[PDB]
Amino acid sequence: MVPIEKLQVNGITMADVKKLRESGLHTAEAVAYAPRKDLLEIKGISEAKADKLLNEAARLVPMGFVTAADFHMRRSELICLTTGSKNLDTLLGGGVETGSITELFGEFRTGKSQLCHTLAVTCQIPLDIGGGEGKCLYIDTEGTFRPVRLVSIAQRFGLDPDDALNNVAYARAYNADHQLRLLDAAAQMMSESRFSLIVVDSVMALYRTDELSARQMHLAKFMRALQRLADQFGVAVVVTNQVGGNIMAHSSTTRLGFKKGKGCQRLCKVVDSPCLPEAECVFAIYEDGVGDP
Amino acid sequence: MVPIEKLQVNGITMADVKKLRESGLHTAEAVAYAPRKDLLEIKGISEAKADKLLNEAARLVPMGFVTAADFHMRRSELICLTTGSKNLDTLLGGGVETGSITELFGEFRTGKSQLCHTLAVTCQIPLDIGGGEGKCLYIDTEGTFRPVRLVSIAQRFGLDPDDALNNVAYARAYNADHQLRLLDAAAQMMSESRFSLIVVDSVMALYRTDELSARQMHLAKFMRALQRLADQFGVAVVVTNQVVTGGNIMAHSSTTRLGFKKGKGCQRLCKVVDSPCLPEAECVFAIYEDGVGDP
Amino acid sequence: MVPIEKLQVNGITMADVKKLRESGLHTAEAVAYAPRKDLLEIKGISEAKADKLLNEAARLVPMGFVTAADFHMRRSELICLTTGSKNLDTLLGGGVETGSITELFGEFRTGKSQLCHTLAVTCQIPLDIGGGEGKCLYIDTEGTFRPVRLVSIAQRFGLDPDDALNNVAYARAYNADHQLRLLDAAAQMMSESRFSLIVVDSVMALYRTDELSARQMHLAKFMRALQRLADQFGVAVVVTNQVGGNIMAHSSTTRLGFKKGKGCQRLCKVVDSPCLPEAECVFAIYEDGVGDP
Amino acid sequence: MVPIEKLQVNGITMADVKKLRESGLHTAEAVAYAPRKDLLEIKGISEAKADKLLNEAARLVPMGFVTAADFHMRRSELICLTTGSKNLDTLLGGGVETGSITELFGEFRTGKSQLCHTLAVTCQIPLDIGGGEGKCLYIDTEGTFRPVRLVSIAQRFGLDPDDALNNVAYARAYNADHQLRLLDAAAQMMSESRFSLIVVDSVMALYRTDELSARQMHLAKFMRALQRLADQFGVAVVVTNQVVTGGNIMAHSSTTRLGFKKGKGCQRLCKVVDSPCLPEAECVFAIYEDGVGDP
Amino acid sequence: MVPIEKLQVNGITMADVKKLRESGLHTAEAVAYAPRKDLLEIKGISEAKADKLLNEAARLVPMGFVTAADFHMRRSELICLTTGSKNLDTLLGGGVETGSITELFGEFRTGKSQLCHTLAVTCQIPLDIGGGEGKCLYIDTEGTFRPVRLVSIAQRFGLDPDDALNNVAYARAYNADHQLRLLDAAAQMMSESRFSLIVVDSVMALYRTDELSARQMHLAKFMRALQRLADQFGVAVVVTNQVGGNIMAHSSTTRLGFKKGKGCQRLCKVVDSPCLPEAECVFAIYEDGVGDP
Amino acid sequence: MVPIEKLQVNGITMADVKKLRESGLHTAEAVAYAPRKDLLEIKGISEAKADKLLNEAARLVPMGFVTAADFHMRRSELICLTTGSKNLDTLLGGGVETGSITELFGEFRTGKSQLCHTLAVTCQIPLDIGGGEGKCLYIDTEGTFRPVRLVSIAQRFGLDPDDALNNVAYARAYNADHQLRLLDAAAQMMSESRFSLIVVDSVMALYRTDELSARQMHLAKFMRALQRLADQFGVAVVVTNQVVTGGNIMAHSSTTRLGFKKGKGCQRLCKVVDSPCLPEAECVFAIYEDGVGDP
């Protein structure tokens, strides 16, 4: 993530830039990726001044071709947050991949919710054990997010609880629009400090409740922005979807199918996933987060 | 194709010419095809000097008549990368035709994505089997491009994978504009080495809010450039359009349109809706881990 | 069409004339119609030698008054290529008139393209059935011309296909200028052998893509040259225009409005046309060319 | 008008005179009006012999003063072919005035063409209704002259059509020059029989590349000849100019200018922009299958 | 103006004189000014008889020296026709001066034509209001003279229109020669009745159309004759020249430059003019002739 | 100068003499210079009586030799009215020389007219500043003489205007002949009072048709008379010739020729083309409301 401050060169003022922040951009990436028009329309950005930026950011953020093999290197040298279950990680190839969206879907109470939570912490863990050493943005749509249940997990991984929670940004989205108003405001934040993973749970449900078509745009438009944020900040996005489901599949590179196992075990497939192989395997749920049987 | 470097003659300097590269042109063809105006506008190009070029390129690239039959031959001798499915090829009259744009459209996950990959490889395949022996330019707008899934395909057709991949230019476009800034940088490439197919997936990002009228208009300016490059380089351009002026700007500018619908399981239907020569007719194909294929 | 060779008399040498060919002229008509200046500027044509030509051609090509009624005779004794649809011909008064431009316009895929093709063949047909026994110059701007689809049509009319195609001059125009560079080079040809009809499709579209004013001159200038060629060689020019549109109307004597009928039928008007009466009527499209329902 | 044949007197031979025809002149008027020089230049015309002519024609055609009022009478007694539309005539103060050139200009398809046709016939109409009882000279530069469309008009005014048509000299000019070579041949005609109006449509072909300065200059040399013939023969000259020095060479040399704009449907507006006598004022007219008319 | 009849004395017969009229002369002035030779060549005028005339007229028409100051008196006691615009007259020192040529020049349609017309009437007006109580000779070269537009002006000044027009001699000059054949015939007339002003409009234009040198003589020769006529009859000559231009300046004592103002106003300078001061000022044009804004 | 009245002695009567005035002579000089014949022809002049005159005038006006140097002095002591422009005077070696004719020629409006005016006044100016203290004879052929424009000049040099003007004899000549009839009447004047310069503008009216040979010849007979008067009276003769034998009759008979060309704005070039003493050399001057001057 290249802060915008690095674009203050060869004629760009922290004041021009400032006009970008309040405009929406929050990283070279932003600029770089931002459409030309979208800079022209910022009051005060000169059609010439705009070209000076795009040109600059483009020097700090790769906007170029690369052999396809060459691509594949830069991709795999990516950090992998951990589930908490050997059997599960082993199936994910180490764990939830960052830079990309990863969709968790299944029937109610099949052990999705439960995993985000865990993940919501193992993303604070030291790279060597599994984590990502970054904070966490947790977007909760339903209303089921209770912090209380995280201590028990943090503990398992050793982390001053009341401190580990101060390490988690919580948002309750009340309407599908809102759910995007936030994404912006969460960049302003992934800008200031360093996060390791975002979790929207559940991307959908707010979209049913509160035509289709229209809906089906709003949604996409979201899955995109999320995607972006992953490119923009290197985080790991995890989205749950409880049984439109394409619009996600599309923009989600890892899909993970959960089924209700026996008692408190839970089966779970890797259904369609670029590199990985279609293999199910069992995991389970305790009082301290996901884990092995 | 004829590199611009060949126009450096009888007065034309590599410095004149460079003024043409940064202008847009990247092949004799380009110059040739280029309207007159379009050269005079170039800062530095003398109304006389321009005449000197248009006249030179025209000597290196035809643009004259030919009998119709004479024409129809040339058209058959022309390459056609292959889908991977007899039933499908058989429908396309052998495969995706080069020199023209070919549009693959349908609802999400109906088999388009899958195809481009395959096609992404079959373009490196020897003419006799089905390929084009050329590299491949792939412009990815969504972000769902993962190379890993090409080995399995390459293997299917026998090719040192970590070698085939080094045989594929990948670009992820982040903004409607950029999607265009690339095309140009991609000519500078198809100039240096020889490519067989271009794939933009999906062009219809041009419609995202990153008015209508305007957007409808960019999507043309693009589709045209694309088409151009197909003229310029002989390649084969394949564009997906995902349903989820609009579908028209397409319709007009594309030469072959192919609609995809979700079959039962991993089978997938697919019509040849609208296409000059070809007859309207659907058929089924299917999807596996090493790429498209028959059922 | 009086070949230029007939001007080799009373002091004109095949060598003077030759200096005309490479200059542009390709028929007495050419000369006759050619401006005085335009001969003077040919290097080697003597202001006296020039007058000797103009004077001569003028003896072979009528450049004179005629009662207006008298005109009307020489006009109607003109050959008429056929559409392939009784209902359609019947509306055109027999079919597309030669010597004049005839504009086919309508919305995309309303059965224009389809007709040129047909026409592109019925112009090889024997006068008694409908045709013009001449070849065909087909200028295609778009890129949609596929010969393959002509056999099926030729067949319908009986014509050694691979032979009927050898009977069609194909040009792909890449830039509006080019589109005129050709017209010249197509005279050199309508000079050598005998053609029955020209088809530029679509005169416009290359003019939008690749100010107005300037454009609006270039265009006219074209519609003119076409017109000329019709006077010069007696052919039939057919131009499609897909929905500046005046510049054509003006220089086009027959205008024919196509609308999309039901299924594969296609309605079509005779909108403004000298002699004929404003009457619509339906036709249709098959695999072997235009035809009746 | 006074045919040259009348100058064959007191020495002047039909052979002297013929030397004047092939020179340009075709009427006493011509000779009369002709500058002196312009006769001396004629190979064969003796500085003395010329004096003998200028002196003779001047006896057959006045060119002297007259009171102004005396003048203004003559001007009213003068014919005025009619448009076909009360509203329009009423605007032109009765119709197109003879003896002068009258310019009809406007964008393509704004009703000019249409008018000339009508006018092309109303000039054969009996003075009492509106006509001029004369034939018509029509010089067509474009190629859009189709007689067929005159019957319908002739009929409207009652005239054996295949008879009215034989009452119209048609010329298609193919080159700027030729347009002039004709005017002369057209005098030889207006000499033999009696014509009522000339129509060149459109004079402004004189501007096509079949420099400017030069072209601007020819368009005058022409407009003047035209004007001349109006003097020479009493006719009425009507020129269209299609928009699509230039519009000035016009402006100066034309006596009545009329601008046409496209009304709603088949109605058509039309101003009297600039004209000695007449007042600036627009009005609407309209177009049908048998020619101009009111709405 | 001394009529020739006054030379019938001490041996001159109305018959000798008659031989002068048909010869060209039309006033003592004529004779007086006429070259000796030009009387000798009149068939019947005796080299002695000729001297008897020259000698006589010279007694009726001043042909002598005068102090220069003395001149200046006889000049200013001259009548001044009026423009119709206070601002304009005020700039002309009362209006167009008589006895002398006054050139009106400017670009097409800059309000020249329009003024002659007016002037063409205010020269019938009673000396006390502005006019000259004389008739008007109007030589029109172009063809733009329509009497109709004069009533409206005459009216403004009160004058039986159909009567005021009977008070104007109109000539249409078709060739530069002609334009002088007239001048003579207009003397025969300014001889019979009394005129107040001549207007040739435009002295030039007929001279371009229908070498230079030759031209440039013919012209001068004219501007002279006009001048003369002004001496000969006391009239006011007004000539328009629309933008050789020296040949006029020279023989024109008042030059007046017109420029196109805004709407229907018209600016106008007094560019070089003996007595007067170089001062521009605005006037305007209506339906009843020149006038003030 | 010596008035003829002085010859009334030893027999010569004012009546003899009058017979000489009406004959042409108006000064001893005249008589003196007069060829013998030219007196014998005078009706009344006895071959003996004439001898008595020629002998008397010769006593009052020299006509004998003098050394050359002796001559060249006299020539410097001689007056020179002034142009009004240092640069110009400096070119004429002080100004327009008296005793000789000085020709000012050039295209219309090139500054000649302007000059004569000025000169028309500077001739009334005190010797010490530049003038000649004499009146001025101005013969105007064109008709463009307006006094009004002399005040402004007179003022420039300080002179009660309505007084300076009464110090200028104006003649408008209407016919080639008359132009001559005047010269004579103008001697009767330069006899009575003392004048400093004569100005005929423009002599070359002598060429208007109010043959050639003849006209060429009159223009001399004139130029000579002029020259004469310069002998006779000491004045300074200035003639303009406007371009618009001919230019030769001039050339031969004029002593100083000055060519004028139109400078930029109101500046004006002017060469000393051909003149005995003076060197060929141009220079610039300029024109204002109070007469000639420097730039």
UniProtKB/Swiss-Prot annotation, chains A, C, E:
Gene Ontology MF annotations: ATP binding; ATP hydrolysis activity; ATP-dependent activity, acting on DNA; ATP-dependent DNA damage sensor activity; DNA binding; DNA strand exchange activity; double-stranded DNA binding; identical protein binding
GO cellular component: a single term: mitochondrial chromosome
Sequence positions that bind ATP: 106-113
Induction: By X-rays.
Location relative to the cell: Nucleus; Chromosome
Complex formation: Part of a repair/recombination complex that includes RAD51, RAD52 and RAD54. Interacts with HED1, RDH54 and SAW1.
Protein family membership: Belongs to the RecA family. RAD51 subfamily.
More about this protein: Present with 6960 molecules/cell in log phase SD medium.
Name of this chain's protein: DNA repair protein RAD51
Source organism: Saccharomyces cerevisiae (strain ATCC 204508 / S288c) (Baker's yeast)
Lineage of source species: Eukaryota, Fungi, Dikarya, Ascomycota, Saccharomycotina
Full-protein interval shown: 81 to 395 of 400
